[PDB]
Amino acid sequence: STAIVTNVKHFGGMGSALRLSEAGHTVACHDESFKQKDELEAFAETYPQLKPMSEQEPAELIEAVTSAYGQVDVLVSNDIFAPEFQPIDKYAVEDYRGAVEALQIRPFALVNAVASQMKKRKSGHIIFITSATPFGPWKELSTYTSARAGACTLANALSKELGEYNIPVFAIGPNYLHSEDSPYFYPTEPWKTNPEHVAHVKKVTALQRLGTQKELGELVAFLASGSCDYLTGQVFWLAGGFPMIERWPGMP
Amino acid sequence: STAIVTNVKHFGGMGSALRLSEAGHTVACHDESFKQKDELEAFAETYPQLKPMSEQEPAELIEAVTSAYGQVDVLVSNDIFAPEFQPIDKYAVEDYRGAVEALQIRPFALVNAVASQMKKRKSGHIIFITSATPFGPWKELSTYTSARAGACTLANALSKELGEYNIPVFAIGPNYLHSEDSPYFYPTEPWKTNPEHVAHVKKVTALQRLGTQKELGELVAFLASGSCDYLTGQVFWLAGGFPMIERWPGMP
Amino acid sequence: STAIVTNVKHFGGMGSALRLSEAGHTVACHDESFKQKDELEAFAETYPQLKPMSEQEPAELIEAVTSAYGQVDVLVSNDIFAPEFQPIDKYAVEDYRGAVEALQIRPFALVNAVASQMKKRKSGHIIFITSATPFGPWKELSTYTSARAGACTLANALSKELGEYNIPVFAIGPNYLHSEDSPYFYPTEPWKTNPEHVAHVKKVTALQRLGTQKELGELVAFLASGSCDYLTGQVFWLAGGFPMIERWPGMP
Amino acid sequence: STAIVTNVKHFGGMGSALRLSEAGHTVACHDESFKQKDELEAFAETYPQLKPMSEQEPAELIEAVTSAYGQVDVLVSNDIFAPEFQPIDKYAVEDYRGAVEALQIRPFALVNAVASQMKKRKSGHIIFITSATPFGPWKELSTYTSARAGACTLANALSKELGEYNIPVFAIGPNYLHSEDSPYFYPTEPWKTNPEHVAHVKKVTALQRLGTQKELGELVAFLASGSCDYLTGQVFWLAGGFPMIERWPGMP
Numbered sequence A, B, C, D: 001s002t003a004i005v006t007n008v009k010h011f012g013g014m015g016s017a018l019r020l021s022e023a024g025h026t027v028a029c030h031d032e033s034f035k036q037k038d039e040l041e042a043f044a045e046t047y048p049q050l051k052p053m054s055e056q057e058p059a060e061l062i063e064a065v066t067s068a069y070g071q072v073d074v075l076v077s078n079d080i081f082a083p084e085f086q087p088i089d090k091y092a093v094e095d096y097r098g099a100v101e102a103l104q105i106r107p108f109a110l111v112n113a114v115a116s117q118m119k120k121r122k123s124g125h126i127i128f129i130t131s132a133t134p135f136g137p138w139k140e141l142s143t144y145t146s147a148r149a150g151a152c153t154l155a156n157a158l159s160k161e162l163g164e165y166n167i168p169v170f171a172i173g174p175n176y177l178h179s180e181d182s183p184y185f186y187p188t189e190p191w192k193t194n195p196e197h198v199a200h201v202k203k204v205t206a207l208q209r210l211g212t213q214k215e216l217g218e219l220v221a222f223l224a225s226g227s228c229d230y231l232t233g234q235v236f237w238l239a240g241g242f243p244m245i246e247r248w249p250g251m252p
């Protein structure tokens, strides 16, 4: 079928797009860099199996894909945002508006555009790549963290109205997901090379390692395959058992 | 100590103000209607034990109460919004921004304004009046429900950084809370008068009744008293057992 | 690899066994009816791709499958119990012990038996089939519901220590899962035939239908494939959107 | 009114009994040591405001108090158990049966005995002192941790059926609660004296300190006062913001 994967170059985009592609889906890909013809084409050249789009806005995109490839059957809103860690009083109120717009508004807009067609054919799948930070908050990241929670809940609420139209909605909240070259949010350097970061990951996750893109993709391809729609409304914590709680003094 | 209760005429406003005032607090009150001196003075006249302020913006309000009454020890962000129920595709993206602006950005702006003074004294209490809908989502209220979840998570995330300064932070998510003459969100008419509504409330809640403003007020006063700061980060579901799940055919 | 599916004739048993077998696994199956050679051989004859065992106790079973098929890589603790709905005061304390013995002690006994061999190879997968009732409790089913919550938490707690040995642990809490000829817990009669029951299911679930054994089987096979071990600790709610919350009077 | 507080000498018993007493309640107290006349009397001597009972079993106790003081209006099942930290394969299946019996069966039995009288007068309050470990599991404590979760869920499920009879049920799950002289589970020595333990607590809780008995008591007296019954079914995490998640390398 036809699927859309946003910000394909960062976070969980590549594992998603690629695995969905492997699963024989037509995968239209969105990303900021697809504004410049050089970047888009460089992309379509390197990945002949992915269909990169230039459209940037939600509605514009949905339409581009609907026309170009018939319709949108799967939506993987892979949302990102570059947050600053800061005491609440040191943030600017616009620093929160940025986070909310990038992590909550964007996916809402996306579902607000493709929603009618899926409901009309009574079929489709919706997936949000959010974050596992709401499950175990770090201090001084209130903006990013709270916005992610809104997205998780958005997904669950939507599963309630779209179930009637046979449309599953899921939220996958990762943490410590190897983003490889992308800086969102766990690039090979330093997470896989610098001893300190390697030891941190080792300590805070139960599996003692970063999550791989293939694992994320396998989940997305599985959910979008229609093999287990009864899971609609589920928030998946892709965080290798994180967080590992520190134990009492004297314990290994 | 000095407390601030926003949108005092609606939602949890009166219960919070009155019970906080009966506890001994100096309660500065905010509300949109107070932009008019006629309203502010009428309110002031009916409630001599409350201090209605005309300030509307976060920074201005905190500063105004800090001047008049020395400081702000307790902040009760009684946030409200009038959402429409609607299929995700029938909403306008602006209908989500609006909801997020009033239910998330607003409480964030207020804490972002009072946070520094509390951290300096290393004392204070922050309480968000959110909603219990995230716990049991209804279909077609995706903007208002997810916005509330952002607020709850904001409170918990904030509890992590402010705890170092001995500042508790809580979220009280109500549902079926009698708002008396206020339309936010369960006014006496028709919730305590109309048989259809009375029946509904009787079915969906365990205690089979609306919550009272006195219960919400007691909880707010208790949390801000310092009797139990160890609860910091807690999300309180004030909904009398809601949601009661419908049982199998043949059962009473 | 070798998998063990308990109580294979009931609950999630068949879906798990069949789909696990279609994936390539050697599926040793347990069941109470297999204490009788007549039953074990009849089952063996109908399902030549399944390996029905007669062992009943945890230690004996793990040992028996370890001998016959080399080892145990995947454990699917498909636990069942026939609880009565009743006011807490109408239950007998023994009615809780019984429930806890079959829904908690049993899965614990099994993992306690296979844990060492998996930790030595540093490979394996543990999956508990629990229940989604903890998420949306019904009144008068306090023994069965709380026992299931113990099972879920057991799975997550176990995911923390076993992750170091590269052993994922999951819990799949189903609800409204078609159990076909099995009485545990939604048999074809009357759940797919009686209009009263068909209506109920249509109201309380988002997808408005029973879950299928194929969906539960797909999920079990996916989790045990190694495609996404980073999900370790996850509690999967397999209930098609349940619980759908009853809306305000006047709404459709 | 008349209230019962079990294991009054350990965990949250003293803060509960005493504060309830201060609140002008007749407080019958249970404890193992109240088997020997020497211990009971020593207790009744030291605390003339508390009424210690010798009865040990649930039913025997409820009856003793009902007769002696008219009826039981408040039940505070303060449950304890001395667990061993151990890899799952190193536990004995009876080590789990112990935990379950002490942490799940006991409170169930207690509510199973006093339940009918509360439902008949359509009034009463039920409180479980459980544990916050299910919210943030440590590795190798699967027994204690999973059983606590069962108790938390028991409480929530009971809130559903007893709400109809106007009986609130709550669960208070502490962690790092100063148990003073009692070894259950954070005695002054070493938690308040040995630098290592003091630094641990400082690190894993947001408030950076143990929770006090007075805080626990204030909550119990507040819930049992009938000031906020609309909170029925709530699980209160009394853990000063625990757990504090470890942040990225380089961060303070």
Ligand SMILES: c1ccc([C@@H]2CO2)cc1
Residues within 6 Å of the ligand: A083, A130, A131, A132, A133, A144, A174, A175, A176, A185
């Ligand atoms: C900062 C940004 C993003 C994360 C992971 C995806 O949530 C963690 C810290």
Ligand SMILES: c1ccc([C@@H]2CO2)cc1
Residues within 6 Å of the ligand: B083, B130, B131, B132, B133, B144, B174, B175, B176, B185
């Ligand atoms: C609509 C708006 C608000 C509510 C209660 C407070 O959350 C319910 C329906």
Ligand SMILES: c1ccc([C@@H]2CO2)cc1
Residues within 6 Å of the ligand: C083, C130, C131, C132, C133, C144, C174, C175, C176, C185
């Ligand atoms: C009774 C027993 C079991 C269920 C489903 C599996 O949890 C529902 C009612």
Ligand SMILES: c1ccc([C@@H]2CO2)cc1
Residues within 6 Å of the ligand: D083, D130, D131, D132, D133, D144, D174, D175, D176, D185
């Ligand atoms: C062991 C036993 C009890 C605890 C606290 C109360 O839960 C922690 C470790």
Ligand SMILES: [Cl-]
Residues within 6 Å of the ligand: A174, A175, A176, A177, A185, A186
């Ligand atoms: Cl991540």
Ligand SMILES: [Cl-]
Residues within 6 Å of the ligand: B174, B175, B176, B177, B185, B186
């Ligand atoms: Cl409300």
Ligand SMILES: [Cl-]
Residues within 6 Å of the ligand: C174, C175, C176, C177, C185, C186
């Ligand atoms: Cl089921």
Ligand SMILES: [Cl-]
Residues within 6 Å of the ligand: D174, D175, D176, D177, D185, D186
């Ligand atoms: Cl504790």
